[PDB]
């Protein structure tokens, strides 16, 4: 690895054009073509541009690449929410037996997205889990924006803090955030209260879902 230098971040509002730069040297970009990749969490990189400016099938033409001297540039016009990702240039470098070099990466943020309210689904413990002498309440929160929530749990109407585990919100494919909160109880606690509640606060509004043990 040599160095392909890229700004750490870029941003725009929906519809704008955002350009990402890649700065190399004589022995990489100066004598080699450049590729651009889009990187989303947990998956392989996605090839956006190859051979300086050519788009593989299925890549929209609002992605365009250009090349100049020892630098290269990716232009994303019609910026959309789904364009939020890390973008990496890459090129061969004529050193040793030849090295493939990825740039340092640019994170693209789409600004001005409207706020969105959460959907909350609360699951009580399954009967089989109770038979295994455990009980888990499952509070699933989706479709909200920006990526911040507060989750509080109640036994009847009293606050419960022990046995609570909550994730940090992260963006889903729909370009909105999801989080989940888990409440661990003994089966006796679950069976001996009137109900338990999951209470989600976001942007000054609260959604409270409540579940109770089943009686036949």
């Amino acid at each position: 690895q040599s160095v392909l230098t890229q700004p750490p971040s870029a941003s725009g509002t929906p519809g704008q054009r955002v350009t990402i730069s890649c700065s190399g040297s004589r022995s990489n970009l100066g004598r080699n073509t450049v590729n651009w990749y889009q990187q989303l969490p947990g998956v392989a990189p996605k090839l956006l541009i190859y051979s300086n400016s050519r788009r593989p099938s299925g890549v929209p033409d609002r992605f365009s690449g250009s090349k100049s001297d020892t630098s290269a540039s990716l232009a994303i016009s019609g910026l959309q929410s789904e364009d939020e990702a890390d973008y990496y240039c890459a090129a061969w470098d004529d050193s040793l037996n030849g090295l493939y070099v990825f740039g340092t990466g640019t994170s693209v943020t789409v600004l001005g997205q409207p706020k969105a309210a959460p959907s909350v689904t609360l699951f009580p413990p399954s009967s089989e889990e109770l038979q295994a002498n455990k009980a888990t309440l499952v509070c699933l929160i989706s479709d909200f924006y920006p990526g911040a929530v507060t989750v509080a749990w109640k036994a009847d109407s009293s606050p419960v803090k022990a046995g609570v585990e909550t994730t940090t919100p992260s963006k889903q494919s729909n370009n909105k955030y999801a989080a989940s909160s888990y409440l661990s109880l003994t089966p006796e606690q679950w069976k001996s209260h009137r109900s338990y509640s999951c209470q989600v606060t976001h942007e000054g509004s609260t959604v409270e879902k409540t579940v109770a043990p089943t009686e036949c």
């Binding site: 190859y50 593989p56 030849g98 493939y100 990825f102 699951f123 889990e129 499952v138 989706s142 989940s180």
Partner: protein
């Protein structure tokens, strides 16, 4: 139509190695410069090495001392073995075919990326429990059901539904890191209410590090 299919055990602790393979379909084994890369959110993307069908290799200099990339033209596969691994080798590993040695450059072909966690703590398989259908929070005519995947280590687990035949309305949430250091996640799918009790719903949970697979049937609660 060119396919790169990842396989392999990933981490093998008894030898402290990381082994992955990639099988090429729809193209010759001489069609690309077969390469391995890895990625981690804070560390960025890193090229590890490449191999031609002849067997000649080129390595990232910082990995050359403990990385071997090989090719089996008979099986149309190429492979990665990384030795003396540590938690610093946790990453999304991807195989690819690059165009460095082709006159007709049509773009590179990319396999799937696989999270491989390198860890020294003990492996923990999941316990899967059904989340019985509930209509309270869904649109008219639909209900949400799911699977709770408890107390596994390390990431990742994968969840499909009805062996992949059900994809619409599936949302597998990110895992929670418990105070115990173990993970749990939930996968929920929204289905037609009219289908409950005639359509069977099964979540297929796979935790490769523990070699565990659970097919959990999710039924409506009754009696």
């Amino acid at each position: 139509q060119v396919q790169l299919q990842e396989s392999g055990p990933g981490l093998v602790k008894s030898s402290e190695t990381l082994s992955l393979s990639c099988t090429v379909s729809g193209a010759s084994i001489s069609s690309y410069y077969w390469s391995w890369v890895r990625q981690s959110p804070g560390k960025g993307l890193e090229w590890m090495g490449s191999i031609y069908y002849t067997g000649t290799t080129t390595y990232n200099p910082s990995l050359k001392s403990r990385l071997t990339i090989s090719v089996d033209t008979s099986k149309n596969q190429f492979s990665l073995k990384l030795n003396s691994v540590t938690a610093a080798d946790t990453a999304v590993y991807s195989c690819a075919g690059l165009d460095r040695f082709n006159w007709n450059d049509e773009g590179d072909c990319w396999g799937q990326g696989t999270l491989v966690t390198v860890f020294s703590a003990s492996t923990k398989g999941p316990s899967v429990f059904p989340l019985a259908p509930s209509s309270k929070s869904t649109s008219g005519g639909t209900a949400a059901l799911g699977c709770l995947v408890k107390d596994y280590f390390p990431e990742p687990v994968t969840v499909s539904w009805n062996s992949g035949a059900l994809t619409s309305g599936v949302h597998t949430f990110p895992a929670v890191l418990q105070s115990s250091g173990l993970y749990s996640l939930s996968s929920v799918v929204t289905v037609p209410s009219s289908s409950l009790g005639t359509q069977t719903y099964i979540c297929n949970v796979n935790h490769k590090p523990s070699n565990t697979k659970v097919d959990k049937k999710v039924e409506p609660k009754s009696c």
